[PDB]
Amino acid sequence: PEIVRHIVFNRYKSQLSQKQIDQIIADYGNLQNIAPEMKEWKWGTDLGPAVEDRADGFTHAYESTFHSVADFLNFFYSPPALEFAKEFFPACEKIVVLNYIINE
Amino acid sequence: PEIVRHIVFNRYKSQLSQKQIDQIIADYGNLQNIAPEMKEWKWGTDLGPAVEDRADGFTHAYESTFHSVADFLNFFYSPPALEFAKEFFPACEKIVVLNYIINE
């Protein structure tokens, strides 16, 4: 089947407390708890210039897996996802998102 | 174990033939046959604005996993990686790379 990866890179607005950033990340992960569509959620922070210096100011990555584009769009337009979007996107100084069929 | 994800987004320069691009991608994947540290290599093309319009001109994603930062670094500074980087990066119109330790 055509399994889809959804990968987000972002940078947070500077005025936000790390406490609130932590909350926003927790809120994102918790979307999996009642959404069967969103699978394999993981995230982390870029390891910095001693590892590699091509992050271009993005600080955080988040990955999730959907078993179809249909599942992704049902999730994306679900009430919990729409409510989370109101806190996530305004918190981003910048963002880039790719959605792709996983080839190996 | 602190598992490292290496996520690359790019866009290729417009003057390259699709044959040339296909070769670069095949070469990248075939680094798994050379570098024992590189695990779970996958790639794909962004699905475009009908699915989500946040790719900011990036067209391709590549993912791989390393079992430690030390393993990533040994790979990154290995002669085959240094060689491939000299083929890959100059072919990019756009490039962003994040390396992160997995959180769930």
Under the CATH scheme, the architecture of chain A is 2-Layer Sandwich
| Count of extended strands of chain A | 4
Span from first to last CA of chain A?
13 Å
Shape of chain A: globular
* Oligomeric description of these chains: homodimer
What is the succession of H and E elements of chain A? EHEEHHE
Broad CATH class of chain A:
Alpha Beta
Fraction of residues in helix of chain A: 25-40%
Count of alpha and pi helical runs of chain A: 3
Question: Structural class per helix/strand content of chain A?
Answer: alpha+beta
- How many structurally independent domains of chain A? 1
Radius of gyration of chain A: 14 Å
Largest sheet of chain A: 4 strands, antiparallel
Largest interface: A-B, 35 and 34 residues
Strand order of the largest sheet of chain A: 2-3-1-4
Strand content of chain A: 25-35%
CATH topology of chain A: Alpha-Beta Plaits
PDB class: lyase
Keywords: Hydroxynitrile lyase, Cyanohydrins, lyase
Assembly: dimeric
Entry title: C-terminal peptide depleted mutant of hydroxynitrile lyase from Passiflora edulis (PeHNL)
How are the secondary structure elements laid out?
The structure is a homodimer of 104-residue chains.
Chain A: E1 4-12, H1 18-30, E2 39-45, E3 60-66, H2 69-76, H3 79-88, E4 92-101
GO molecular function (chains A, B): lyase activity
Protein name (chains A, B): Hydroxynitrile lyase
Subunit structure (chains A, B): Homodimer.
Quickly list its features.
lyase activity (chains A, B), alpha+beta, 3 helices, signal (chains A, B), homodimer, 4-stranded antiparallel sheet, Alpha-Beta Plaits, lyase (chains A, B), Hydroxynitrile lyase (chains A, B), globular, 104 residues
